[PDB]
Enzyme design. Structure first.
Site, PDB file in Angstrom:
ATOM      1  N   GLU A 109       0.868  -1.130   0.086  1.00  0.00           N
ATOM      2  CA  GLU A 109      -0.132  -0.065   0.031  1.00  0.00           C
ATOM      3  C   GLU A 109       1.016   1.269   0.038  1.00  0.00           C
ATOM      4  O   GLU A 109       0.238   2.087  -0.654  1.00  0.00           O
ATOM      5  CB  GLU A 109      -0.974  -0.003   1.059  1.00  0.00           C
ATOM      6  N   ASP A 133      -5.160   2.618  10.399  1.00  0.00           N
ATOM      7  CA  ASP A 133      -4.150   3.030  10.299  1.00  0.00           C
ATOM      8  C   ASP A 133      -3.562   4.096  11.242  1.00  0.00           C
ATOM      9  O   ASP A 133      -4.229   4.998  11.807  1.00  0.00           O
ATOM     10  CB  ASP A 133      -4.238   3.926   8.940  1.00  0.00           C
TER      11      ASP A 133
HETATM   12 CU   LIG Z   1       0.200   2.966   6.412  1.00  0.00          CU
END
Ligand SMILES: [Cu+2]
Ligand SMILES: [Cu+2]
Ligand SMILES: [Cu+2]
Ligand SMILES: [Cu+2]
Length: 325
Positions: free
Chosen positions: A155, A210
């Site tokens: 990611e 996150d």
């Molecule tokens: Cu991250």
């Protein structure tokens, strides 16, 4: 327009139970120490962090798929593996919790990414294990809902984001599920007036974690679509505090992680292989980012263990409420 699945408020006894850690403490830290390593795409440590996720979830009798695929980077074609673990593969609808397990390749030196996203990964494994008894029980109700965990790979960007340059795991998975066709007919107990054309429609809401683990995070509702789900996190953190179940520095303090503010309007471009396919999103990410963000101080010693444990309470109670555990 109402959330398609009706709420049942978490039972007081469950709240009280979800709220007192009772070492658990050791299980969580032991799980986290497995992730406090550089997790660079294609590396051996990376691969072993995958093997750890895969084993842990299989050990709990979850179905686990490794979605392994090549992708064009600016450093040549690279290999990537997403991990999707689904508690009850047959259940039409999925409450999905996700995070990425790759760490940023850092221009300056060794980047551990303790908050980004070692802690999120650990919190997911930890949720699964810790709620296993109630989860195994919920799985055989035939109610058409299950839990699913997605650990994305790749990611984190390599460069100054050309829209061609990151989100390898999410772009790939999103597409794969968008193109793999299905219908209410082939699945178990879809909701009454739901429309399922493909696998991605089975993602009932995607809860993405996150940049967790620093002290005093502030979250906001980043999507109006998910605002009813988001409110459950607010309400749960409020009950936890009321019950005196949060760890604070001093007596008579409260945590206020989850802002009751009206929905904010931040740039939401990185979820987007999902948003273009209409997957409803709750992003559990602080605003502003932690001060350690993408610095080499994103390490083990900068984690705030009391914040982390409080969050763990919120996440367990939340999962429990949503699946009516
Ligand atoms: Cu991250
Ligand atoms: Cu209970
Ligand atoms: Cu990052
Ligand atoms: Cu977001």
């Amino acid at each position: 327009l109402k959330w398609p699945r009706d709420l049942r408020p978490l039972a007081h006894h469950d709240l009280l139970y979800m709220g007192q850690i009772s070492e658990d403490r050791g299980d969580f830290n032991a799980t986290l120490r497995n992730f406090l390593v550089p997790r660079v795409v294609g590396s051996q440590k990376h691969r072993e962090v995958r093997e750890f996720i895969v084993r842990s979830l299989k050990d709990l009798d979850w179905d686990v798929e490794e979605d392994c695929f090549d992708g064009q980077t600016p450093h040549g074609i690279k290999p990537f593996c997403n991990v999707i673990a689904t508690l009850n593969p047959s259940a039409c609808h999925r409450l999905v919790l996700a995070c990425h397990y790759d760490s940023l390749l850092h221009k300056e030196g060794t980047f551990i990414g303790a908050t980004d996203s070692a802690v999120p990964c650990a919190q997911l494994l930890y949720l699964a294990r810790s709620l296993n008894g109630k989860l195994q029980n919920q799985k055989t109700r035939g109610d058409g809902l299950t839990l699913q965990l997605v650990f994305f790979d790749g990611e984190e960007a390599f460069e100054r984001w050309s829209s061609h340059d990151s989100l390898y795991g999410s772009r790939h998975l999103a597409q794969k599920w968008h193109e793999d066709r299905t219908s209410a007919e082939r699945l178990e107990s879809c909701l009454e007036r739901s429309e399922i054309a493909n696998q991605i429609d089975r993602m009932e809401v995607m809860v993405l974690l996150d940049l967790l683990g620093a002290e005093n995070p502030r979250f906001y509702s980043y999507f109006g679509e998910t605002q009813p789900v988001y409110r459950r996190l607010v309400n749960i953190e409020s009950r936890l505090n009321d019950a005196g179940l949060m760890e604070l520095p001093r007596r008579r303090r409260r945590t206020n992680y989850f802002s009751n503010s009206s929905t904010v309007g931040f740039i939401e471009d990185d979820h987007i292989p999902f948003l273009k396919r209409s997957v409803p999103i709750v992003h559990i990410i602080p605003s502003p980012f932690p001060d350690v963000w993408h610095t080499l101080d994103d390490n083990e010693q900068n984690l705030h263990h009391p914040t982390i444990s409080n969050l763990n309470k919120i996440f367990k109670a939340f999962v429990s409420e949503y699946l009516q555990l």
